[PDB]
Design a protein around this ligand. Sequence first.
Ligand SMILES: [Cu+2]
Ligand SMILES: [Cu+2]
Ligand SMILES: [Cu+2]
Ligand SMILES: [Cu+2]
Length: 463
Amino acid sequence: RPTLPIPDLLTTDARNRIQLTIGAGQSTFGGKTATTWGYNGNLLGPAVKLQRGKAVTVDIYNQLTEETTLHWHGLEVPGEVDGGPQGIIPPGGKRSVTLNVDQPAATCWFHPHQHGKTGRQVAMGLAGLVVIEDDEILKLMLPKQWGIDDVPVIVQDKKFSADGQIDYQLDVMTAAVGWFGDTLLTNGAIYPQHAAPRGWLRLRLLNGCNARSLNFATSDNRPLYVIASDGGLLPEPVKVSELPVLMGERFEVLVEVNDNKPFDLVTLPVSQMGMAIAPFDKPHPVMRIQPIAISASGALPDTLSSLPALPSLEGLTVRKLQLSMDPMLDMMGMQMLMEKYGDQAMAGMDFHHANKINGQAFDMNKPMFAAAKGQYERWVISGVGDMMLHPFHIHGTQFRILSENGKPPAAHRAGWKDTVKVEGNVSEVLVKFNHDAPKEHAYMAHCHLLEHEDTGMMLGFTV
Ligand SMILES: [Cu+2]
Ligand SMILES: [Cu+2]
Ligand SMILES: [Cu+2]
Ligand SMILES: [Cu+2]
């Protein structure tokens, strides 16, 4: 097996700058070459390393021949640097942003957010990581050797055409159920191996799929200890036997590594339209972990961090967000899915503006509302009326889930999140915005099933 590719951990240079170049190159998948896009490379991207309270400048060079934007998913930053659909970087051009991180240590990530083209640009290869550090997390003595016992694991599916090229399409079927494929990539590689020292292995998991939800487990049923969610550390580790991860979500886990016993990280079949078609009808290997005997000091602390109590709900502004899909899209998309793949596609169960929030497909010129600044609000997001999975993402914030699709959140999902599951039921989140976002650079709130976002299921809001 190939070794697990390790993204460069990229810090500021002598001028306090970080350079990202967006460009097209070539990658090889199963011995077939494909045109791919990457940040500072042919595919995916580096891990940008930030320190809480230390402002840096990021220079972003777009060397594609089309427009793109660079969104920092999970970062609590002003709208002006948020890199949403309004943050256009011309082909051949450059945009610079100041990032002054004012949030706890976390694994965030970045990716394009081009209006109606986000699914395609991510599918082509564009994604990178953000590693935020603070004073607190370094005192913990977690596994911290980047690429050795602290490793990023970006998991993505793709589909390829016979000629080996990435086979992306935004059509009525994918607008309904998402773009998904039959080939699983792990930091861009197919079923790589990672050699990890005996002791604790820290995995920073990112579901970077367009539309496929994942569910991580180990091949020999050793548990995963969740230590962080989207927005950082949990108050204490949460032991799980399997770990569902929605599109765009991150979790950090520790897993035990003992000699003479390699094991796989796998993903388990999920109950999501279309996502259990072979080879995903059975547990699917993600990567092989090979124990080695080199230095490792990491530990699993009893206590990780301190999370504030939920604020009182009384008096809080309530914002209602009704997600919906045009009945025609729902009908025709599910029909095409069924026709193409048959019964297995439901195992466990103008389209360009057919997906909507509050009866409106995304209008970049009209933010739906102005949220308060520095005040908690309660946002209620409903997927009642269709059966699709909507990982709902809100820019500019790390929030607390109050209720997730009809139940209180699981322990490992009760900390800082920027995504919440909405699937045929209703979710509630407690959100606060610490930074400005004017109409010209509004925040987005949207489904992170990228084909839904690209066909309308997004709103803008100001702070
Ligand atoms: Cu995102
Ligand atoms: Cu985001
Ligand atoms: Cu959706
Ligand atoms: Cu977004």
